[PDB]
Each structure stands twice: as structure tokens, then as C-alpha cells.
Amino acid sequence: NALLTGKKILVVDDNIVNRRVAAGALKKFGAEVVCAESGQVALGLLQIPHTFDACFMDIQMPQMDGFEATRQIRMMEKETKEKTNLEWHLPILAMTADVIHATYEECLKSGMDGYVSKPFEEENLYK
Amino acid sequence: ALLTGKKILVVDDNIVNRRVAAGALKKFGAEVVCAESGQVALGLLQIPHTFDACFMDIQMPQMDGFEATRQIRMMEKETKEKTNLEWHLPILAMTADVIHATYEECLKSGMDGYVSKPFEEENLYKSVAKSFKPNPISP
Ligand SMILES: [Mg+2]
Ligand SMILES: [Mg+2]
């Protein structure tokens, strides 16, 4: 697959600037993008059945972080599978750039000169 | 070898990390001293010391790597104030633990992966400076 034409993608992030950046990146490849400012708003949009092909999930959000949002999505999918035999599995990718940048920023602020980086630390994972 | 003649302090509360870091550095010829905590590291870094660099775990109980680094820098700043001598220990964060833990919780919570290095739109970093008034301009 070269393009995201015909795909509809949910971007979940409490920071509107991140939502704009992520949306612009995905639309460049043809995606239709819907934004959600919280995990709560996202769970509402993902009530099964829904029309989303993938979701990018911020980690640090107040009230409900991205891990709790994801657990709730997987619980919904598990209930539907058990009640209907239909197996939904929304692709969910974390947006980890924020947490990594914040870690390096605190290293710098504390007075460190740099960091040791192992090959895995800055790679993306699409599993 | 690459680090022959260098002495390096490894600060990490996990013995396995200390083993791996010291083993790597010795492969390059370095002398390695390990410390299990910030408080131990600060005792070892009383000025003057003989260390050429320090690898600093960020997450440790009682004193984390940021606090330990701030106190090292305070030691160095006081030395400059009192003696005029310049001390600036290279300190590199060991971040693999915190980043591992984040990626692991992504997968444990049920995510299919993560994006730390995103695609960046052509226009993300581009912009034009514009002036309200006409203005000549040169290098
Ligand atoms: Mg956030
Ligand atoms: Mg630690």
C-alpha cells in the first residue's frame, strides 16, 4: 500500500497543535482524518460498528491516558467478538514522540550533555 | 583502543544495566567505576575527581538522574566561583529503560505499535518572514 486513499483515521491528542500536525501528515497521503481531543471523545466515536480504519493515540492526556483508552477499545472489541463472532481489531499506534522529546528535554534542563541511544529507541513499530 | 586511558562512571540502580554498560565500555579499553545510586555517584564525583565521563540512569529511587546531575553541576559552578577552575563532566543519559517501559506499556495495553519518528509534511518547518513596513535587507 502506497496511499491512504479511502481510509479514515482517528487522531487522539489533547494538544491541538499535535492534532494539526498529525492530520496534515495523514492527509498528505490521502487519508480522511477525524480528530478527538480526549480518550473519552475517542471512545464515543469508536462505538462498534464504526467506520475507522486506524487510530493514532497520544499517551499523556489528562483524565484518561492513551493506555486506558486503548484498553477500553480492546474490551469493546472483545465483547463484540464474544456476542457476535465478528472480530474487530482497530489498528492503534501510539504517538510516542511527545514522551521521548519530554524525556530528552528534562535531561537537557537538568544539565546533561546528551544521551546514549540503542538501535531500538527511535524506531517506529508497525506490528 | 578507542577509550584507552578514559575512566567512566556508570550510575544505574539495576545491576544488570551496570554489567552491560561496564562490559561494553571495557571492550573499548575504558576503566569503569559503577555506582548503584545518585548519592554514591556524588561521593565519587567530589572535585577534584579523575572521571572523563558519566553515564546516568534517569529513573532511580531516592535520587533520580536529573537530581544527581543538577547537584554535579552545582558542585562544578561552586568550583568555578571559588577557584576559577573549569570542571564540566560529560554526562550522558541512559534512556533505554524509560523508552523501553513506554513501548512495553503501549503493547501491553493492546496497541499495535508506536510512531516516535513521524513523517513530516514538506511545510512543517517552512515559513516566510514578512515586514509590516518596507525594509531593505542584506546579509
Ligand atoms: Mg498529550
Ligand atoms: Mg533505574
Residue numbers in the entry:
A (entry chain B): 916 to 1042
B (entry chain A): 917 to 1055
The article reads:
CYTOKININ RESPONSE1 (CRE1), the main cytokinin receptor, has a modular architecture composed of a cytokinin-binding CHASE (Cyclases/Histidine kinases Associated Sensory Extracellular) domain, followed by a transmembrane fragment, an intracellular histidine kinase (HK) domain, and a receiver domain (REC). Perception of cytokinin signaling involves (i) a hormone molecule binding to the CHASE domain, (ii) CRE1 autophosphorylation at a conserved His residue in the HK domain, followed by a phosphorelay to (iii) a conserved Asp residue in the REC domain, (iv) a histidine-containing phosphotransfer protein (HPt), and (v) a response regulator (RR). This work focuses on the crystal structures of the REC domain of CRE1 from the model plant Arabidopsis thaliana and from the model legume Medicago truncatula.
The structure of AtCRE1-REC was determined in two isomorphous variants of space group P21212 with two protein subunits (chains A and B) in the asymmetric unit forming a homodimer. The structure of the AtCRE1-REC-Mg2+ complex (referred to as AtCRE1-REC-Mg), determined at 1.7 Å resolution, encompasses residues Leu918-Ser1057, extended at the N-terminus by a Ser-Asn-Ala cloning artifact. In the final model, subunit A is comprised of 139 residues and subunit B of 127 residues. In chains A and B, there are two, and 15 missing residues (Ser1056-Ser1057/Ser1043-Ser1057), respectively, which could not be modeled in the electron density because of disorder. Each subunit binds a magnesium cation. There are 182 water molecules, one ethylene glycol and one (4S)-2-methyl-2,4-pentadiol (MPD) molecule in the asymmetric unit. For protein structure analysis, the full C-terminal construct from the Mg2+ complex above is used. In the AtCRE1-REC-Mg complex, the octahedral coordination sphere consists of six oxygen atoms: two Oδ of Asp929 and Asp973, one backbone O atom of Gln975 and three water molecules. The lengths of the Mg-O coordination bonds range from 2.15 to 2.30 Å. As a result, the Mg2+ ion lies farther away from Asp1013 and a water molecule fills up the coordination sphere, bridging it with the Oδ atom of Asp1013 (helix α4).
